[PDB]
Symmetry: C3
Subunit: 665 residues, 3 copies
């Protein structure tokens, strides 16, 4: 076979995992929405793509959302000019669909499980309380002169009121722009200026993992260079003394106490912008999502990819500064009317048992996190997870990067006790909602495979050299989409040329994701890393996931990243950055001996061309807060270009860049 699965210690013939009994409607669990096999998925999926799928999408849109005005046209526009339209004549409001309609049905149902940084401070927030708080904030924003179409910046940590802030903007038709709490003043400034908001919402301080985030201090530094911001609303999260500017800055509780606890919903066109979300090369990229298609995509993917039922308690452990928090903490779960988790802490605070204490306390029915969190808990030891119950879980999700089969198995074995479906969800900020993922009651999974495209997604593999679609199976190339889908990003804010050039020009007629992909002999899709991260060794194309998956098969390896660099003989050579577990004895095992064994492991599993030319042992890797490993930073450092690096002040650990610069020289 030309296309191989990601390296695993399990043989292939024992590596196919059918939907487990918890996903078969047994042991009292709800029956899956799609099942019980691959054919039930394909039969439904075929209704959602092609020239006869308008019927299905119109019905789903009218069944799933409450509309003030019906639409006439299902879809229009396209990639070439970036004029994508879905349900254009309809009107609706996102806050109405996420709060009001559920509040009118069951006001005391829990909307948010607020898991505070200190576990003892956690509590449930009802739909009634969340709707009231949202309306008070919306009334405060209107009193500042915020109109429909105005942008509002949000610099809030993971406290439950962050959802009220998002939905207050949606309620009045303002465009929220959320920035990770803890981003530097410089990074915050650039995003506040780019979206041209006149109002910013923040906290006095944030609390994450027992550490204080000095959010109001950062905000004051940033706003000295933000001439459009006239009002700042400050939530008193810690009560520690912070500066407040007379006139400009007001306390959230004091402002909201002035306002009634209901606010009318602005009637939004389907294509009115809902939010701007800046990704984390050059200027910040503000990805713009509209209202109806985005909301529909998040609601349908939540329902089908995680098999959400009305009583479920959905635990997405990500941050609302990330698209994962937008779609699968706030918009998806609340549109469906279920309970969603807002997790304020880290996976290891107070201890690495935190995730599993949370699951057993609240009886979470789904858990959703990133491979970086999974690898972190994998390296912390089985004592923190082995003696928990965790049987309320039916589905475990992974998002943000390829999941190494080694990490996949740890997730499957300890979090799921081999009784949960594992959904590896591939998508991007620009896709709005999950693009490729197994439907858990239908798809038999392979460790590290996203499996099959979601409803409305018609994806292909293109040879990057020819620009032509590769038909059949056992093919590898770059991932593209043939047709628009409801939740696709509509533009890059005030930079539509960047939007067309990045996604629509490389392969005209297609959407270009920017990731390498392979379709194996069974038709399963494998997303093996960024196209920019592919290493070309003597004409052999190497993906980062396969080498990193091979490296982590060696004992004591916690996390790795591989990058290419120009080589005189092979064009490019592989350089590995390897993080061993801190307990690994670097004196008993020689670094030169460990590097040799790692290279042989890569050679044994992939081939002679894949063996790293050099291996660097580092204590950690440069990562974004969402958990993405910044291989571009490592690649430029290896190239001796530690000067041409972009904005690195808001990465997870800025100091690790210094350690990497040292170890290379």
């Amino acid at each position: 076979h030309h296309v191989h699965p990601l390296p695993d210690s399990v043989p292939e013939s024992e590596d196919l995992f059918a939907p487990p009994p918890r996903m078969q409607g047994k042991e009292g669990r709800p029956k899956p929405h799609i099942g019980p096999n691959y054919e039930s998925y394909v039969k439904e999926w075929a209704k959602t793509v092609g020239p006869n799928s308008d019927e299905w999408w119109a019905a789903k849109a009218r069944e799933t959302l409450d509309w003030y005005d019906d639409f006439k046209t299902v879809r229009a526009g396209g990639f070439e000019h970036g004029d994508v339209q879905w349900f254009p004549e309809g009107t609706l409001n996102a806050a109405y669909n996420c709060l009001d309609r559920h509040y009118y049905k069951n006001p005391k149902k829990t909307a948010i499980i607020y898991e505070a940084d200190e576990p003892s401070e956690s509590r449930e927030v009802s739909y009634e309380e969340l709707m009231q708080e949202t309306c008070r904030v919306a009334n405060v924003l209107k009193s500042y002169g915020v109109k429909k179409g105005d942008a509002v910046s949000i610099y809030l940590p993971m406290t439950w009121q962050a959802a009220a802030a998002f939905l207050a903007c949606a309620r009045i038709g303002a465009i929220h722009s959320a920035v990770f709490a803890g981003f530097s003043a410089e990074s915050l400034r650039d995003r506040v200026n780019d979206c041209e908001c006149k109002v910013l919402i923040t906290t006095d301080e944030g609390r994450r993992g027992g550490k204080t985030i000095a959010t109001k201090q950062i905000v004051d530094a940033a706003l000295q260079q933000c001439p459009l911001v006239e009002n700042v609303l400050v939530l008193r999260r810690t009560g520690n003394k912070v500066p407040m500017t007379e006139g400009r800055d007001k306390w959230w509780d004091e402002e909201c106490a002035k306002m009634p606890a209901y606010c009318p919903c602005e009637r939004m066109a389907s294509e009115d912008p809902l939010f701007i979300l800046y990704t984390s090369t050059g200027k910040p990229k503000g990805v713009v999502h509209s209202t109806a298609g985005y909301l529909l995509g998040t609601a349908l993917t939540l329902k089908y990819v995680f098999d959400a039922h009305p009583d479920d308690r959905f635990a997405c452990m990500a941050d609302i500064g990330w698209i994962t928090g937008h779609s699968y903490i706030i918009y998806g779960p609340l549109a469906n009317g279920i309970t969603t988790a807002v997790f304020e802490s880290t996976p290891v605070y107070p201890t690495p048992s935190r995730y599993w204490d949370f699951v057993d306390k609240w009886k979470a029915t789904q858990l959703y996190t990133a491979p970086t969190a999974i690898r972190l808990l994998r390296r912390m030891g089985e004592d923190h997870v082995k003696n928990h119950d965790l049987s309320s879980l039916r589905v475990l999700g992974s998002v943000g990067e390829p999941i190494n089969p080694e990490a996949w198995h740890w997730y499957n074995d300890f979090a799921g006790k081999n009784q949960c479906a594992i959904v590896d969800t591939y998508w991007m900020t620009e896709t709005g909602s999950i693009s490729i993922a197994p439907l858990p009651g239908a798809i038999s999974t392979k460790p590290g495979s996203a499996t099959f495209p979601f409803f409305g997604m018609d994806v292909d593999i293109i040879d990057p050299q020819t620009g032509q679609v590769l038909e059949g199976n056992d093919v590898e190339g770059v991932l593209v989409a043939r047709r628009p889908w409801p939740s696709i990003a509509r533009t890059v804010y005030r930079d539509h040329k960047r939007y067309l050039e990045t996604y629509m020009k490389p392969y005209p007629g297609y959407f270009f994701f920017g990731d390498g992909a392979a379709r194996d002999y069974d038709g399963y899709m494998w997303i093996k890393g960024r196209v920019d991260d592919v290493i070309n060794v003597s004409g052999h194309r190497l993906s980062t996931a396969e080498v990193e998956s091979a490296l982590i098969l060696h004992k004591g390896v916690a996390e790795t990243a591989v990058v290419g660099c120009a080589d005189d003989l092979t064009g490019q050579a592989v350089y590995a950055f390897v993080t061993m577990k801190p307990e690994f004895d670097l004196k008993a095992t020689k670094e030169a001996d460990l590097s040799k064994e790692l290279a042989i492991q890569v050679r044994k599993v992939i081939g002679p061309f894949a063996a790293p030319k050099k291996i660097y042992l580092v204590s950690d890797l440069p990562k974004t807060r969402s958990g993405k490993i910044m291989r571009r930073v490592l690649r430029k450092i290896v190239a001796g270009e530690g000067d041409q690096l972009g904005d690195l002040s808001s990465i997870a650990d800025p100091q690790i860049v210094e350690e990497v610069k040292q170890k290379v020289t």
Copy 2:
């Protein structure tokens, strides 16, 4: 042996029950009542409007009574505790469309407003067409000033018919009007203009009332020196006397409106978009906020049922639009129903005290609605001004704003109604939006001084004020509360929701607290006998202001009285009475010491030994607001020697009376 007594009356109780008269029975060609013919017909309909199955009735009434651009789905939600009351939330409508356009499309030449000018010879009818055209011109002017949906607009206008055009022009574009009584001082106007943060003010060059000039533009000029946000003033040329105009800021209404077309589209408003702010007559000005659909529905239904309004009716509410009574029962209620409404620019006694009745016979008014202060005023002026009029076009006479003493009630019944009209005593507040407790005139047999029974949608209880517990059964007295939200309840206090919750929702959690004392007699009739703050406690006996004042006016020659409490060592509190005799009363022939002695015995005979005033002060007038409320708080603080902590009293009806009362106490 009854714990609860009717307000003191010279008529014995056995002859003091007044069944709906023939004009309210569909006889003599009068329209058949909407509800009747008895108490049970009221309860039968009322029971559909409260309780857990009342959504059906309210949804049907909402869709039958108003024109909507978009239908609602949800009937009601929210509640008292957080102040998130919602009615018909997904619906959209426009108040101006419901008060003007839909009636104009059906009968453009029908009279919308009977404009009774200060001089009777200048009175005229204003058709729906003309009112709609003027409203649209003003709305276009406001839009040309940059007024947007949700912006507040202050209105400082006297009772000329264009005041209705100004209100409805704001409603038409979704602006929030804030009307201030014309004649309020520059200080009171300033405080309200600044609180609502408006950028536009609408006023007149001058007002005319009772042959006197109100220097409105002068007051406005003085106020705006401390109102830095107001950028545009639109000035109506009511008198044409020369007034200063500030270049740029001030423009003439007629010149601005001549530039604009006579139609303007209606802004499609959410049911819960704010319709207006109305500042009430203690501390900082309280801007009571009403939303759109529930408020409009409440005014339309109360006008229809409490006054038994029919399509050809000519409704004469004689109040001022600076008052909630003018908002609800001059402009929004009558015009929403598509009938004719009166805008009365004068006083009850100008040129003579026959003015009200000349008006009724001139225009054939079918209902008259006024305040007890006006009724007591006309009672004091003599029967020659009323006895020889016809007045037979009237079917219903209403009283609003304070308890009506049975003595005044009977005068109203006897001379205004010639014992052939139903008398509707309507209890409500600015915060309730529309009438809360009132007799339905074709159904309820009235008792002088009783509001009788709660209106549709109002589920009221009597609570022990200390324990918070409901007093079940009849013959109980305590404080009035409502159990559930109703469509027209005020939604907030502007930018001060904490004050709204603390005032109405926090004192008795789970209820709306009106602030008035109340009693339910053995027949179940409700008696609202005064504000809770005005109750006097003499030796453990709770005394209401209405009962003592009603006993005092039973004495011959008494025009009007007010009673307040003050600290007493032996009885806890003692009663002090301020008494206004008719000026024609001979105070030399009757000794003042004898008159006070006769008054005390009259009180003792009717109420009990404990109720006799410890001291009585004879005054030429009482401290009253413009709407006629007697300011007992002012009198109480003066008696307690707290004439330093009175507050803003510059815009009361007669500011000088405070000087006479302060002198007379010492």
Copy 3:
């Protein structure tokens, strides 16, 4: 002995009636007319559109012809006396949705605009898709400037196809466009920009017309020195020649639109929201049209007066600065979903064959132009038209002034080859759409007669001295309308008093057009000139059209204008300005002899009272850019008031005023 005579013609009356030709009878492969085949078929349909039972017809047409977001309840209300005209008041719609989106959703690649560039080789077809995308980009740009619903936007654009996108971008967001003829002077532009109080102006670097450069940005910069409210100028790069650009205020159209997405939601407009202000050419008069009635009127008149069918290619050769361009280039044709021509050139550039080269190249099915253009081509000679095909044409239209029978016949003979119906369309900026015109499939035409009123128009003739309606036929007086019609102008911008005084006060209960009119014995209507231009000779009333029609019957006459002046004996005396063809030899032919024959011709055809007291031979006449002859200018010069003429800097050829002033003295 008829009191009312047809306009003077060289054809006897008995041979001057032209039934619909075979191309308008459904023969020779043409589509069957919407109304036909005779006068009774017109009356039968017309009678449904007027009177107290016509609501049914108008409600149905409104719902059949336009797409609505919200239905209306009331058909019509209001009236002339106070200027509160209302049509479909509760309805909501958007003009850009009706002219672009709904056609784009059906056939995106269909040509919306035939862009006939000033140079023929640069002409091209613009699809509905391309036009909608450019409209949406511009709308997004305007929104980014803070333009809100109800804001005025000035447009100073020449006849390039993006002018339609600029109009429709304003309509899309509910802004009120105010278009000013490109080439109007800085003073005339300044006055219109200041009157509408716009904060945004859209223009070009330069225009190109007849091979000449219009220095639009230079004119704009001079104007804006006296326009303190304008904050943003959007500049279309039409020529790329260097022009001044003011930092901050001025931005390039292509650079701004490249930042914006190619779709924009439609603002839901009430039927009576203003759609545009159009200043006519004392203080400038900004005529205001609302949305639904205006759009319905233009769509119905285009369909019925020009018998437009879905595949037709409609060629209106006027300028968008004129109401004719508003109604019959942009709004009418695009509302109907057909192809419309945007003609950037002049009728004689590069040569006088331009119109007919255009018709044969694009196979135009209808042609619409002004009598001044027809008279211009008539003077240029038959060689430029005689050898063209032109058989794709079915209907030829004339708009803007009376068409002399001599010019009518030239149009009929050479443009139409006696095989097209000629529609003489009478209307005004204030009427929105055609008022009186033959329906080409039903009405037999007379040269110079508008014939019969359009649907919804109930017109009468009033004796100006008595104010009374003249019943019956063979009557002459002033034209009035009895009832409002859907597309009537609703006000004069911020000058409603001028609106009432001009149109509604002279004859209370009627709309006063300002034109003299006669109804002949057959019931045909004749519009013979403005009331202000009527000449009173010894108590005999003379219209300009009849004398000007008689003068052009003389050989060598290209164009004439007749005006009155104070006379001691007759009250007023006739003065004629006559333009001979430039090839006419004024040395071989005595001017005194030519003047005598011209006077005798008038005496023979009209009578002794009409014979000009003086005749002036001029090389050209003072005309507006739309082609109206400025007889008010000529009258004041004859009266010796050549100083109090007012603003004449933006007329077609301002220098000709100097030549006329010389020749009179």
